[PDB]
DNA sequence: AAAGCTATTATTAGCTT
DNA sequence: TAAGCTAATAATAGCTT
């Protein structure tokens, strides 16, 4: 980035939100990257700060949760 | 990287391995660093070729889950 | 502004031993 | 070789309209 940052939370809800849709949209693209390129299975869930839900699954979310209890 | 590479499976079990364990480590510590910045609850369950589980939670997984099933 | 840009930082693929 | 390196690619923080 222009500037180095340090990992605390953002106080400015627009920037916060404007870093989430993007780093969400980079944390998604390397869970799927890694299922492909590694052939593994992978379930990401993520809530925001006003709750809202956002997930990825490289399968059925349902497969990969089951797995996960059934471990 | 020193080449670009394209995104599909890689063949050998060695490389494949080396690249699973860097970027896992990336991909979680994305994750962690989004949870952070945004304040945000996550979940991440992998589970390699192996069919080894590897886990990150921002908070107790068992809860996210909770979250999850409920808000659905 | 909201959406696109780019200067700079961060990740990582193959190199080195 | 298994662990460290670095050239090169990828992501992204603030810049810009």
Same mark, same amino acid.
């Given at each position: ?37 590694? %052939?593994? &299975? ?17 399968? %059925? ?8 209890? &059934?471990?």
């Amino acid at each position: 980035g222009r500037k180095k940052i340090q990992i605390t939370r953002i106080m400015d809800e627009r920037n916060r939100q404007v870093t989430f849709t993007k780093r969400k949209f980079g944390l998604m693209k390397k869970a799927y990257e890694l299922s492909v390129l590694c %052939d593994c &299975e992978i379930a990401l869930i993520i809530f925001n700060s006003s709750n809202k839900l956002f997930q990825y699954a490289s399968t %059925d979310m349902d497969k990969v949760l089951l797995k996960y209890t &059934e471990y």
